[PDB]
């Protein structure tokens, strides 16, 4: 239990593909859509999120991929 992104957030719309400030938090240091293990999301939730992020990337708002910066 490193940190669950379900808790660090109030309530939001999972079908909202424009809410970058939320969505941003379900991706990794790379653009990669986090695993349900780190998202804490339901089984149904994760599939919905999944599509919303895809929609939003295609819109230009979220990244397909990043580059890992050795921090």
């Amino acid at each position: 239990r490193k940190a669950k992104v379900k808790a660090t957030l109030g309530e939001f719309d999972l079908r909202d593909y424009r809410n970058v400030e939320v969505l941003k938090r379900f991706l990794s240091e790379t653009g990669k859509i986090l695993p349900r293990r780190r998202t804490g999301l339901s089984a149904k939730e994760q599939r919905i999120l999944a599509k919303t992020i895809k929609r939003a990337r295609i819109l230009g708002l979220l990244p397909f991929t990043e580059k890992l910066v050795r921090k």
Binding site: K6, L9, D13, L14, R15, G40, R55, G60, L61, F64
Partner: protein, 101 residues
């Protein structure tokens, strides 16, 4: 008929009197294809996550319209001809799924 959500992304560099004219030509395609507009949100411009059309920003339009179903596809590739449009994405409206912890 059905209700949707028209998204459009334009390039950020349009001077006011040029950006005004894409907003009208949009609104006349809409007009044209039965698309009755319910409400609009100009979010202006955000910074993108990747270079769409080589430039790092993009100008954003949103339109909760009410087309007749079977013409939505025309509307889109009719919106998308206009050169200063970098991306169009129309999408069926759906009730928000809420989540917390």
């Amino acid at each position: 008929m059905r209700r949707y959500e028209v998204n459009i992304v334009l390039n950020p560099n349009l001077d006011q009197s040029q950006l005004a004219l894409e907003k009208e030509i949009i609104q006349r395609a809409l007009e044209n294809y039965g698309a009755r507009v319910e409400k609009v949100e100009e979010l202006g411009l955000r910074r993108l996550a990747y270079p769409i059309a080589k430039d790092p920003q993009g100008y954003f339009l949103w339109y909760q319209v009410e087309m007749p179903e079977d013409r939505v596809n025309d509307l889109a590739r009719e919106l998308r001809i206009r050169d200063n449009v970098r991306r169009v994405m129309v999408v069926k409206s759906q009730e928000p799924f809420l989540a917390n912890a």
